[PDB]
Design a protein around this nucleic acid. Sequence first.
DNA 1: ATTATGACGCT
DNA 2: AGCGTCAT
Length: 430
Amino acid sequence: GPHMATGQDRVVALVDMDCFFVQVEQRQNPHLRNKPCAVVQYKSWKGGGIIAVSYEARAFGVTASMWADDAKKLCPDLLLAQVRESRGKANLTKYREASVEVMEIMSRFAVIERASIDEAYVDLTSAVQERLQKLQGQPISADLLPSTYIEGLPQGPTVQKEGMRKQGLFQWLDSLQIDNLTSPDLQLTVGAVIVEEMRAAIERETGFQCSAGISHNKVLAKLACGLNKPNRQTLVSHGSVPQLFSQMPIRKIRSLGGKLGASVIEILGIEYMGELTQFTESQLQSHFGEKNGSWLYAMCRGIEHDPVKPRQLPKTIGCSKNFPGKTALATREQVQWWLLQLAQELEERLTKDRNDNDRVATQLVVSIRVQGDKRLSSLRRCCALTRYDAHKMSHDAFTVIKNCNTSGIQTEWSPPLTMLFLCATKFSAS
DNA sequence: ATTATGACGCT
DNA sequence: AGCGTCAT
Ligand SMILES: Nc1ncnc2c1ncn2[C@H]1C[C@H](O)[C@@H](COP(=O)(O)OP(=O)(O)OP(=O)(O)O)O1
Ligand SMILES: [Ca+2]
Ligand SMILES: [K+]
């Protein structure tokens, strides 16, 4: 009762750019705007691999992880933009720089955690408190929430999509004004007002649209964000959780989309997140470990405590290339040439990072895959990164992996290498 | 023959 | 440390 924590202490948002690499290419090339289009890397094998898809193209069934030749079967008029190639490899700089544009705007509003190239969590608790003081008990108008969905509403005693959105928003605001909701509900609502403002600023200042979720923690904000995409935001209140979770497949919750989630389903014989509430904390810990068990026990009740970390910059800077099928690296000089290409891109990015962000990487991680290996990485070795110099880094990388070569002929490399990976890590202030 | 990333957990 | 999981 009175001592039962409800995980309603924070306001957290997750902002997720819509079709991000496609928007970056559409801003650059107006011919691609409002068209079925996709971003592809490379072109020779089956037309290239699709890595991002506009919503117009998704209507035809085009997805990422599709070959462009196959996407064209579904959507013959699909437009394509190619990822830049430099030094023999795909180069993602344009998208990393577009990411910085958005992250810097978000940072004006609040502390953010960079979750990926186009996702950031936002801790809005303090901003909401501030806005509430400005507001002075003045009610919140629907006009302040023009792209907001309230999950679970409308309900109870119009067949258009926007009409439904407004009906739900009206019910929510009507209740807030009549004092039939909770202080956490008001906090979330003010959070959503701020996120409208944030999303408007992103679009104004970059041209890019995004979706967002607002809730009391990162997992619910992420779940919320996906409910209404694209170009919309969704508020998931604490009270919405029992209905929302009652039919929510376990794999939809972040961290449960893989083997752990499959084990939860199999071991417990359940399908939906809400079904977890019937187990004790000890029962869950007994199957999934102390940490996972406690996390699951709280999470299925809508409670999570993972903080929004104050981190706007990536912690690592890496460069990798696959060498599939017949293109696997089978000679010494091949391996060395590609290590150099990778090291040259890495040096370029590191030098920029050092100038921009007042830090230096101190460790170089070298990873390879060998042909036949089940896993993405076969071997990982570290060495010191003491100089931002591509020839040195590439020579050092060779040294730490050269003994993986089974070949008696040192000119040859066996078994052939199907992946090379260089990663700069362990930053120190500079 | 998805590819190129990136954070965090385990022992 | 080196490996594995989960995610954009
Ligand atoms: N598996 C991947 N391989 C390479 N690039 C990827 C991969 N997944 C995502 N990306 C890139 C391209 C995406 O535009 C960008 C952001 O990813 P993501 O949020 O999953 O999709 P998206 O922004 O294209 O569409 P959505 O509107 O559904 O969010 O990161
Ligand atoms: Ca996205
Ligand atoms: K994303």
